[PDB]
Structure 1
């Protein structure tokens, strides 16, 4: 039986579409382009640095990813504007069903936690700004292990902090590549697919594929 749930941050709980708008305000007409490439570089850099054994915290990785993005687009990025766009991640709005769903799952007595890339301080900030803080038992960052997902050492961390075995911790994520990693590790996996995307072809399939957190509650 699942006694705890490990949540993903962007795309699972919080909507990042906010950042797109904040980018377009900085560089009018380019918003969708900037945010699209910026997000991919953030992913790539965490993966690539992990393979090379050259870690840096997510904040740095986010700035670097933006710097490359603008340089690649022919956009001039000053320090001031770079901080603003980066601060945009600390002010995300959750998906509509999120608040109620979290309250209901906590009612059911499940231990809830968040495992993200950023510092614990920033993770706290996002959930506090959204007034959701009180619903989480653990706020985890990959920083302690100096590596990023899907390196299995990040998953153990989630397992250790929760004081439960992986088979009793539901891994919830909107990223198929992450759900694949979790699935290989041992966590029962729940893929959050809202916009009709397909699963990655790396030998895995999630235990459950849902369209929102509303469906997650029904499982309990």
Structure 2
């Protein structure tokens, strides 16, 4: 019996493809190439920094990842362009079904929370901009723990804040690596696989695999 739901932010509720536009507007033609690398370095820097115990918040990791991407592509990223592209993450667009689904889940009397790598500021900005702030009971950031996902200390944070046991909290994630972690932690996991990717080969299998949040609403 689930009483709450924890959602990953970037790539699950909000689409990061929105960034490719701003990237191509700054570096015409290469927008897709920049965004692709940026996304990869962003994740890599959070994983590697947590392992070396050298933490910096998501915004710093994002700035560092962009600086590496441009330097790696030979692109001259000036100060203002840097700030501009990085500000794009504060205006992501929610996936089409996201807004209506959040309302229905909430209406069913479910506790809804966000467990993201983003800083408390980032998370706030993104959800408020999309005007979805009111539909969330908790907006959790990994920041207080000074470590990123998939470190169990991050997941534990969701269990504490919601005041429920992990077995009554559903974990919804688009990244198969994130779902693997939460599954290892003990959260019953729902994987949102819209693009038909395959799960990671790290010993885990989600409890549910759906194509969008729509299937989640109908799970209740």
- In structure 1, how many angstroms separate the alpha carbons of the residues matched to 2:99 and 2:32? 27
Q: How many residues get paired?
A: 220
Displacement of 1:53 in angstroms is: 0.8
1:184 corresponds to? 184
Deviation digits for residues 183-211 of structure 1 (CA, Å, limit 9, x no counterpart): 00100000000001000000010000000
- In structure 2, how many angstroms separate the alpha carbons of the residues matched to 1:15 and 1:59? 17
Deviation digits for residues 137-196 of structure 1 (CA, Å, limit 9, x no counterpart): 000100000000000000000110110110100000000000000000100000000001
- In structure 2, how many angstroms separate the alpha carbons of the residues matched to 1:121 and 1:168? 28
- In structure 2, how many angstroms separate the alpha carbons of the residues matched to 1:198 and 1:10? 19
TM-score by length of 1: 0.99
- In structure 2, how many angstroms separate the alpha carbons of the residues matched to 1:60 and 1:12? 22
Displacement of 1:17 in angstroms is: 1.2
- Structure 2: segments with no counterpart, 5+ residues: none
Where do 4+ consecutive residues of structure 1 move more than 6 Å?
Answer: none
**Is 2:79 aligned against 1:58?**
no
Displacement of 1:121 in angstroms is: 2.1
Displacement of 1:15 in angstroms is: 1.1
Deviation digits for residues 99-130 of structure 1 (CA, Å, limit 9, x no counterpart): 11000000000000001112212211111111
TM-score by length of 2: 0.99
Cα RMSD (Å): 0.6
Displacement of 1:92 in angstroms is: 1.2
SS of 2:199's equivalent?
Answer: coil
SS of 1:5's equivalent?
Answer: strand
**Is 2:206 aligned against 1:206?**
yes
